[model samples]
Target chain A: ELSYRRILLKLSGEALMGDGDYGIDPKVINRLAHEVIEAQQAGAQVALVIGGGNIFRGAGLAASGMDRVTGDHMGMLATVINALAMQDALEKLGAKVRVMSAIKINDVCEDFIRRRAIRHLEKGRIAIFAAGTGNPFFTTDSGAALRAIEIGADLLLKATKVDGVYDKDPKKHSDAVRYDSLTYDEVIMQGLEVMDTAAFALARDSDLPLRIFGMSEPGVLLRILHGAQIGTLVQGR
Target chain B: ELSYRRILLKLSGEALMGDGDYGIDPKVINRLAHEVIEAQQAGAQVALVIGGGNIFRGAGLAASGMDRVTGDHMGMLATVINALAMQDALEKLGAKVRVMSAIKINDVCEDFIRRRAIRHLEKGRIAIFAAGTGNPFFTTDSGAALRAIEIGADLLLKATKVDGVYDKDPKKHSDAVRYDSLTYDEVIMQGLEVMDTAAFALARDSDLPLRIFGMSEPGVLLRILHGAQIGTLVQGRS
Candidate 1:
């Protein structure tokens, strides 16, 4: 039903919050878990890297005079927490899931050993990566790209609130145009903000094409894996 | 001020709780951090393995039908949380600290890589080991022993409420007597409940000595490093 042998799903921590100011909305997580399961059932080795803005707001930490390193550590912990919750939801849905952290929390999850992670995917288990690059000052966007390359993912599927990349802010301009496909150069020259500059550059270097799509639709994830052109695809020429 | 060059301190999740039932008591953590700093100032490289009973009770999870492996994983996360809080307290006290977990949560702390952990100790940073061997069915007691052996610590100082090892539970028996020192054999033969069986076996195999001490008295850890015979010392030989 799908062509991709492996794929990486990039989720923002805020995406876990469905119509809420903070924390994970169980309904949203449950739905996402089922969607992921559906994708897996269609024969794709799935890996996920989730951001941490839902649990920890970096601005708040900075306001409280926390150092960047410490705040990032806290944010990393927040992502691990999110990963654990997702693992739980996925397991409850009868999917084999492995939560691996870049930082060692051995008793809680597996270490981000590349070989081990690959083996998990090879065995049809979903590996959820947490703790952005195990380093400070690195965003989860970069982490997602790094892992997408590391796992040799066929595609990096980025879930967003908007349907696709637009020429202007869709919320601000009613007449904004959406692009169904674009080159990495167009995304860069036009400053489309598909991902952080670092992430965009990394994906370009790795030749990992990205698909940005809205997650609001109930079955959009499975639809995408079925070769449906539901979102904007960004690729390198 | 201390004879030991490097030492491993084993603190329980309950140790961080103080007189409370659950969660971390900031006062207790602050006090313990200062004690650790004192040990560091006394010229000892300190590596720690703190348990997670204060934050997560595996038995409670078991009661709710959670599997053993998952419960152990939750407990491991609980230890990392405690380690983070301890790291914060240590930093506030101006003691350089590195929190490493066996389970990689890289952004929050370092992975328990031996060379990096040794580097931290060499540079006079306290290394807090968490997540309990990164494996299921292994207790934090075992984790402490494994790290003690890995770091080549001179001794494992287990902070306990009771001052020393007793033939019977001190709370249950008024006639209980404490041992000032012990052999690994005696600990095994006499059925002295100093640590878990796996931890005891690991300590014995690695030829690591252990000190069981009471943490209730203020400045006891520092005093022990200063060569005060405040608790039971279990060793390989006389």
Candidate 2:
């Protein structure tokens, strides 16, 4: 359970909202911020990529007569807001947090320079990456996976409600069984839905391990960081 | 009443959300779209720059503990949102509208290319510009002046609540009177507040006429387009 020394934790924008309808939940932010700080203080370098579903949903935009490309750009801004809130929360706890944005908001963030990002992580600053590759139509998931590969993170931690990868929809199918481990080829052959295809492919090619699990329970992050069998592990080997 | 054949129309983001607290008002967008179409149909090459006050405000961001630069970036996105909505409204009228953005949202907009913008206007398309100056500190007013100069527009139309520029704070002091017209030097000496300093200087140096006026009234735009005394016009030449 000591495999991880550096980790990238990817959370959905909805995760920041907690149980509210819209807007942000400060409690959830500080809670997660505390978790991130705990993990960092325990000697693991942590980075984050957060999705923006809580602020702007694609369907809501489509219903309002917005095109996909425009909606995606708006979503990129949503991610930036979430990144800022997280940074605010982390900084309040007196932890050093830096936002490396794909879209340049120079005064608010450091532009995503991979080498500069690595230096920050090595120096123990939590890097909250934002804006999803600075392009429309690329999901935040793609950004998460790409950043993890770029930083050579030992594991990419994907936090979802479900505990692990299953043969079928575990919630919908009682007969479903979870896979403790799978190689890149096995996931491809099984036709499993891990991430946006591009993100999964990037991770697969780079030999990055993906740990999919539930982060609703606070300490699941640290447990997963120590290589606990809390989720399905996907890797090239 | 024939001074302007080419003009740049700039509006606040709140103009799009008329009578609403937040989000957009379809009626306001459609109304503005109709006016723009009519202006273009009447032989005027029109370009636009709209502010983002409706979607995001500096005070609100500050209250939420955000710094000014980050707020500005968010405001830039807000402007883009309004631009897209305006584009959608214009296209629905079968009017070809192109969004030229300063910040690169490549798939959704054309990057600001002065030459291409000129070409678009020549082709009779209304260019809706978004993302002010591609910089945080610059205001949309700066964008309006810069774009008007770049396009060699005959006038820059700043649509405000007041019908014209006054010698003093007209709303605050009843004795204050509106200026019918003023030279750049007069405005400078009179210490008149126009666009942000950089923007006003840019307009003044380029000899651009700025018609400050109220556009809440329908047809006020076209009236001003033809050099009507609908507002105070500021230009060079004593």
Candidate 3:
């Protein structure tokens, strides 16, 4: 607890959309931004990788005659929009923020430069990574985990809609209990779907600890930053 | 005449946004997508390098407290946002599209594999290049020009707001005249702002003929595709 100097936070795109059926909700984005902004105020170097389901799921809609490559691009763009919304909110909270992309627009945001990302964190600028590797067919979860390692993030804070990792489907099973701690292998062996397979593998292989916590819990991120044992910490045994 | 088999269309972020004050206008993007759709429908491969100004101006806004390197990353994200909007608009119009970044983002789009880009273009899927050079102090204009050569584009269609290059300030001057054509050297010697210096130099060095044309003109893209002379063609001097 309270050990990370730099961390990569992964949140589902749908999480920031709040109760909206689609797209990002301003309140949700603002709250997420505030959470990171607070962490920066606490002097933690925060980098983020948000999933893109809120905007479009190209693979799911590919059969409707929409080209698979193009559909994937639309999804990538959706992430960029989410990144911008989050950046705007974070800057509004008196935090200096920069949104970097896997792709370069030259006119809008900065290109995804590894050294620059590290530098931004060192200089105290909150960086939000967008475009999800700019590659179709690959999930943003993989991009998040990869970036976390590339940037030397001490941990990957996965902001979940659920309270924590459960033994079973918490919604489906009333007896499902949250695990305070679990090994990466245990989660995999149990077939627990706390994180995407690609994301889980990347984090596990890189030996990155993952802290899964609810985004709605007020001060949950701050608590984590303060080193409180409030969320489920998943790591290699 | 159908002279060109494939091409690269380079648009500034400001170009796509049109005269809008900020962000993307659905109508403008839809029409652009229609052009590529029409080109592909006619059997020509089309690729693109879209600028990022439609989102946020990194260079123009990095003056206060932001670090130079930090500002570049922000600029890159801005371009991806623009590409995403364009991709959305293109897909809504039913054209296949792929966004590829120069550095690497394996999740949302594809890697900037030259072979893969070629495959996408051959398949008639529009390849939109985003995140110029994945390096700082680089412009999308340069990225387009460089990519045009790399992808073996027959021509780089430099889409601009104005119709063609003018000898003087076309708007302020009472008797400004547009040139039918000029060598790339003339532009450099005259200090004309045809494009970013690196882009112009690269285009010149690569012998990449550029057709500086107004994108607003209906059927302009198709006309150029069909070997129709429609704009200022910049090439080596005779």
Candidate 4:
């Protein structure tokens, strides 16, 4: 019972790899593919933006004195590797997926075609955006937000290790309470750090609603997707 | 010496097929690989947006009763296939390359990353842009122009089967006059299709200059790179 028509699911590249430090773990991605399939069955148009951390970390290279630009390019490729893994996983789950990049790489994935991507969404196929805005010094979260705006997504479903947005670290504070609803200004002023500053700014400027949910929790994304009362919904209203 | 910092080169996907009808011709892509390598030697940051017509023709599909959107998606994939072929050629030529798609396949190419693309260009590596706008209805020509604008290139180089944009089809009319320069509006008013309407509109709106040159003329792209005035210039002054 999906209440939404379109959604951008943001996942870290590590989500696909599971316990492994590098590359994709078939089991984890298979589970995610199933969850996405379920959401699709509920009639949600899903687009994904996955981070590249699972395959390689470029920040380490930059710290080692590699040119920031070159290091970032390597990280972009890392995201590409992750995109391929997710594509394999999702395709196995019977989902037709397309990966669009902001940077162009041939001999691998398709170019990020705006109209083609929208067509895939309209055709009920899932679209995964990889490569993280094809830029360095930017997080995949910002890329997700940018894509969300470009794709005109109804909401952004941020899948994290945590359950929802809390005022304090849930692990540290026994009494930390999750806010079911929040405004852009409130999130900004409170410095919740649910998403990075760039991602938060873009969403705020666009007035896009964001929902933070725990992918680890059983049926959490499915629940919020179906209009069930769960997770924290951050919006202007 | 190169005068421009960054440039966008537009080629029809068929150019990579080396006179083949469908798929890629390794020889054709290899030739292009040399061109890119030469350009890099001349100290220019280069990016490419090649059309997908060689593998599939969306306009033809539209003519055959397929929906424009459907045909366009097919065309876009055709460009990705071409881009991949080019990637192979370029890498074999020993140029570090990345394939970024507007449509994420993730398996074969990287998702389109704008800043990373700039970084690649900055680092003297070649980037091949595949898929056309990730949209089904747009042409790769438009995609190239959009990317050219986005990347802030100095010029958009349109590579075609013909030598240059002329008053009439040069092959059909022996007397067709080729202009050295023409404004974007003049091209439209004259009804000469140098580039697609959408692509031309964007280029005009953004004031991006373009040059049309023949791909068959060997080292023509290099000639253009070295500031040789060989191609038809499309802009306000031209």
Interface residue Cα RMSD of candidate 2 after superposition? 4.5
Q: What is the lDDT of residue A152 in candidate 2?
A: 83
Candidate 1 lDDT for residue B211: 93
* Cα-based TM-score, every candidate: 0.61, 0.75, 0.59, 0.51
Candidate 4 runs further than 4 Å off: A58-64, B1-238
lDDT of 1 by residue, B1-238 (tens): 6767889999888787677555566677878888889889888899988897765542222224446676677677768767877787788778999999887664567788998999999999999998878888898989999999998898899988898888778898899888988899988888778888887899999889899988886788777877878789899753
Candidate numbers sorted by DockQ from highest down: 2, 1, 3, 4
After superposing candidate 2 on the true structure, give the runs of residues whose Cα lies further than 4 Å from its correct spot.
Answer: A1-3, A16-34, A54-64, A77-119, A133-137, A160-208, A213-220, A226-237, B18-27, B57-65, B88-98, B102-116, B161-207, B231-238
Q: After aligning candidate 2 to the native by TM-score, how far in Å is the CA of B158 from where it should be?
A: 2.2
C-alpha local distance difference test of each model: 0.81, 0.80, 0.75, 0.74
Alpha-carbon runs more than 4 Å astray in model 1: A1-68, A96-129, A132-237, B1-3, B18-23, B55-78, B100-123, B132-134
The CAPRI classification for model 1 reads as incorrect
Q: What is the DockQ of each candidate?
A: 0.12, 0.18, 0.09, 0.02
TM-score of the second chain, each candidate in turn, equals 0.95, 0.93, 0.92, 0.91
User: Model 2 chain B: which ten-residue window has the lowest total lDDT?
Assistant: B55-64
**iRMS of each prediction in angstroms?**
6.7, 4.5, 8.8, 14.5
Best by lDDT: 1
